[PDB]
Point group: C3
């Protein structure tokens, strides 16, 4: 493999995050005050890293930070129950850890932390974050295994109830690549509804990475995946591979949902920047 690959992890990383009310009523996380986003910033680490997040709640309501998949002690689970959320104006330091796979003492195999995960609030609106999640307090987390192929770019598509990334119906988001780019998608679902994520012209493996290790990988190859609240998966595709440049739709394939606006464009451009038929 002469594509770029993830290094062995084991760093201790530090990071500041904030939760802000947005002018429009939404709420979002951010690495800097005044720079919050929905989805929140992507956090990306290598198996074995430790991540210390100094999180500061700048809102008038209790808020928290709960993560999927990664190792964390009960003091960092972000629930009111475990006294793990954050009062208005407060600051708390969450710790997320990750480990590599390996043999246990009993001889069994411990799974690694690697995968496409996500983080979200657990105390805004209800003790389960129904309010925070609806408002935009969610973001992606990627834990890489040594040797994983690194992409050219990562995009995050969150089906949040009847919206993509809390956007107005029929307003995307759209993404751009050039034929040949290694594009990574992180795909998260939140809220009340099941969906099916479909991409025109591209396909991926329904496994941890979206990629087949080689000819022995029995994983199904798909272009349509059902998902429900808090499901997270990801994959890599070579933009336009075997199909060429184009305005390639992605969307929920629940007919009413796509009719109502859960559609976006994967805009794959020729080297001259053009998109056939757009």
């Amino acid at each position: 493999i002469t594509a770029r690959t993830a290094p062995a992890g084991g760093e201790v990383r530090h990071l500041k995050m904030y939760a802000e009310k947005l002018a429009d009523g939404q709420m979002g996380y951010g690495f800097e005050k005044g720079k919050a986003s929905v989805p929140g910033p992507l956090i990306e680490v290598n198996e074995g890293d430790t991540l210390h997040i100094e999180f500061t709640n700048t809102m008038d309501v209790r808020a928290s930070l709960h993560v999927h998949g990664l190792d964390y002690e009960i003091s960092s689970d972000g629930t009111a129950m475990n006294k793990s959320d954050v009062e208005p104006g407060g600051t708390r330091t969450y710790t997320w850890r990750t480990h590599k796979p390996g043999r246990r003492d009993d001889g069994t195999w411990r799974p690694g932390s690697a995968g496409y995960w996500h983080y979200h609030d657990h105390v805004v609106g209800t003790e389960h974050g129904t309010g925070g999640i609806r408002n935009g307090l969610y973001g992606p987390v990627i834990v890489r295994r040594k040797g994983d192929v690194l992409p050219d770019a990562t995009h995050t598509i969150v089906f949040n109830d009847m919206t993509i990334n809390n956007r107005k119906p029929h307003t995307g988001p759209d993404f751009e690549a050039t034929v040949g780019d290694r594009v990574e998608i992180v795909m998260i679902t939140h809220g009340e509804f099941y969906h099916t994520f479909h991409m025109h012209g591209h396909r991926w493996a329904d496994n941890r990475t979206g990629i087949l290790t080689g000819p022995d990988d029995p994983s199904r190859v798909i272009d349509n995946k059902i998902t429900g609240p808090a499901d997270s998966f990801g994959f890599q595709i070579i933009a336009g591979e075997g199909v060429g440049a184009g305005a390639w739709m992605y969307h929920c394939h629940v007919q009413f949902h796509s009719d109502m606006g859960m559609v976006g464009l994967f805009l794959v451009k020729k080297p001259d920047g053009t998109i056939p038929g757009y």
Copy 2:
């Protein structure tokens, strides 16, 4: 293996398809005028084949042909957006390609096209084919990999909203086999609802082919599979294997749906044609 297996592909195939309005209000694809069906005809090809489909819309409304999984250029995605649908009475030649898996230049592994896929309209009723799909404009596509086991017969079961293959509730379809037949199922979902596909007395591997390569295949073995709009999977079973002849129900396991008629019979006969207790 002394079962029949798929050959290496790489032929250029040519096909004529039509969309027709049916007397009863439904819409269907067909290989000949007046011989349309719901589901539409099964297209089956080998990885590496190219398929040129001269498609003619015999209806009074615009209609199109959109396919999952297979390779196609933006001019064949069958969307209005890309000027890819077909005006009433028009004729257009869609091209679908397929490829085998293999090493890329960067050392990574390109997935092959092989799988259980499907095609459907994209412009009847809405820019997403909600009307076409609901009227019956969907059909199965099978792309086989060199060495895949070939079945004795293939049946197609489509959960379209509250119906199987657009049939009236409680009217099947029923299928028939003789104990020992290698029966292939293509299972496709369409519309607004999630379902769970269950088959009594039989089970399959939840992977690309429904079959375990051998003792190292970690794939879950199941008899119940959740599916959402535009999901497609398939599998093979040995009719009556380890269970004998019988009228074996298949159905959606969502209690209300099976109660409302999403039920059918896998009628597995003894060599004398009889079904115990039917």
Copy 3:
């Protein structure tokens, strides 16, 4: 050096009953007056045969239908096939299981092993809608030779808007000690899709919930979408890499967790304490 399942092949016998419960529910049991919701766990090894002398103590027809395992049409528990059981009746269902192996044609036959379940098929409707709603469901585990055996198994069933037919916001809760090998059988029933989530723990989305080793492509997850009659299972090391604590599990459909589909996986330190509880 963990305990592993033996090769199967025993012929097992078992009595089961269906009872109406005082509160209106219905449940299976191995003994009259000892029925549960979920019903008792049945566990066997690939190759075992299981003869269940089922007696219906209810005033309505009831039956016993199982997923995954081998059974003849006479044991499929449907009214259609004349294999349900009249009130007060007794019928002997036979479930069989086989190991994997090469067929005559050279193909590979899948084994019966997995996380399965049984439920009624004739109470309320010809599909058990009433039986299932009332509590007539339980788990079945078929083990493959060599499978890791757990310290304890718990069964979590998402039945419509309930866990194990319990009032919203009443668990069930489960207890382990940091380090225990805890097995979960997770079954869904009724009308709704759910997503099962556990705080602080994860598993492999394959047959066993465990990775055989480095070459297992299976996704590791902590959220699984699930629909009526879906069954999966897994083992976790309680508190592994996360420590003791009151770890929530719940449906992650926001409204469902708000409405009460929540429970606690109470992982204790060796002194019995739970930080923050």
